């Protein structure tokens, strides 16, 4: 199970610093170049850097102006990215990836990025962390109900229903930024009309940045 797991992404202020980690498992870590790729919100993929098996060759995208440093600890099977003097344009999901083959030489990059991690979100902003307020959307045919997850920052929030047992018909809409500088979204689910009042429905909201977990009961009025 070749597994790459990023960690360290979080809210950070402009001009600050942040260290990302990438734990590898399921293969000989010392045999492969490792890659860092990022994806800013609403944009495509942007290569950031790669490092050779022994850490001798460290290359970066020029646009970073040397603000990042890629390092590696083969003993701990861990890859790192030290991000300094952070800027708003650094906000993005950062992926680490393994390269199946090393460089052929003469500046050529490593090839075949066969495994990518889940990614870790970095948010460069001066605004403060704020947890969400969860409100119910109270509702034979089909009925609809949901939860309003309002006024939180930064992204993301995860929303489940009945602790994950209720997934059919669920739609958790992408968050929208309001003039307040906060995000809000709704999570809805369609259920049998005859189930209202008999089968209880609960939305479990998790906002990791604020360490907030809220379970809200959605009962009919």
């Amino acid at each position: 199970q070749v597994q790459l797991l990023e960690s360290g992404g979080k809210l950070v202020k402009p001009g600050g610093s942040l260290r990302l980690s990438c734990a590898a498992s399921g293969f000989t870590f010392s045999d492969h170049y490792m890659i860092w790729i990022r994806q800013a919100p609403g944009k495509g993929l942007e290569w950031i850097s790669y490092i050779s098996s022994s850490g001798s060759n460290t290359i970066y995208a020029d646009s970073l102006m040397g603000r990042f440093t890629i390092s590696r600890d083969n003993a701990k099977n861990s890859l790192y990215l030290q991000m300094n003097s952070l800027r708003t344009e650094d906000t993005a999901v950062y992926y680490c990836a393994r390269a199946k083959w090393g460089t052929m030489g003469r500046g050529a990059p490593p090839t075949i990025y066969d495994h990518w991690g889940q990614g870790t979100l970095v948010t460069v902003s001066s605004a403060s962390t704020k947890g969400p307020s969860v409100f119910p959307l109270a509702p034979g045919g089909t009925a609809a109900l949901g939860c309003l997850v309002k006024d939180y920052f930064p992204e993301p929030v995860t929303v489940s229903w009945n602790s994950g047992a209720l997934t059919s018909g669920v739609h958790t809409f992408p968050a929208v930024l309001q003039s307040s500088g906060l995000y809000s979204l709704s999570s809805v689910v369609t259920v049998p009309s005859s189930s209202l009042g008999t089968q209880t429905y609960i939305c479990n909201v998790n906002h990791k940045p604020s360490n907030t977990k809220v379970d809200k009961r959605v009962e009919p009025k």
């Binding site: 993929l45 992926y95 075949i112 990518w116 889940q118 929208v176 309001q178 809000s184």
Partner: protein, 218 residues
């Protein structure tokens, strides 16, 4: 640097039909050894990219048998022999010849399906939110196709403008449908100055506009 350009930008296709995504490189990716250093990736919504093709035409381990890579030099093609509903997403080509690594602009595969009218629902503001001092009114348009839909709010038959926020889900990987929320937010005082709150929806699958409303709040 090497510039990667993809065509088309958006590719609507019905399941069962083939799909071809083209990738053009400003520099030849063919080396003297006869190999092309071009890779293809797939990114489904909210997921990490996944390798599909490497070295121009080699299918990665675990990739479905319907994906194939072709081309050489400056032009390459990702070929899906038989598109399926789950193929909705964004596909990127990446050159692996020179540093910096550069990606194409990406191509979004949209799954074409039969027209489906939206199921419209309206939710009044909860008492708990009203106790906090504001009122959000949510209108839900569930499982419709095509994506294009219009929502018009009415407060006591007064057309609303510039006070509503919309959000649309990505294309469902199973039934290839979309869903949309429209949220009208007001202060409790403002919300308590009006009685009827209505949500009017227009869509191709609807022979006529559908409306949903409620009372109270005044």
């Amino acid at each position: 640097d090497i510039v990667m350009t993809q065509s088309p930008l958006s590719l609507p296709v019905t399941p069962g039909e083939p799909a071809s995504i083209s990738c053009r490189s400003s520099q030849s990716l063919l080396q003297s050894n006869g190999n092309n250093y071009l890779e293809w990736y797939l990114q489904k919504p909210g997921q990490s990219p996944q390798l599909l093709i490497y070295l121009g035409s080699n299918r990665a381990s675990g990739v479905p048998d319907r994906f194939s890579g072709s081309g050489s030099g400056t032009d390459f093609t990702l070929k899906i022999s038989r598109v399926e509903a789950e193929d909705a997403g964004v596909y990127y080509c990446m050159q692996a010849l020179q540093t910096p690594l550069t990606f194409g602009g990406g191509t979004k595969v949209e799954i074409k399906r039969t027209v489906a009218a939206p199921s419209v629902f309206i939710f009044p503001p909860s008492d708990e939110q009203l106790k906090s001092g504001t009122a959000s009114v949510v209108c839900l348009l569930n499982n419709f196709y095509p994506r294009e839909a219009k929502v018009q709010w009415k407060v006591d038959n007064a057309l609303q403008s510039g006070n509503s926020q919309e959000s649309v889900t990505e294309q469902d990987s199973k039934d290839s449908t979309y869903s949309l929320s429209s949220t009208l937010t007001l202060s409790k005082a403002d919300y308590e100055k009006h009685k009827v709150y209505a949500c009017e929806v227009t869509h191709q699958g609807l022979s006529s506009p559908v409306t949903k409303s409620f009372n109270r709040g005044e």
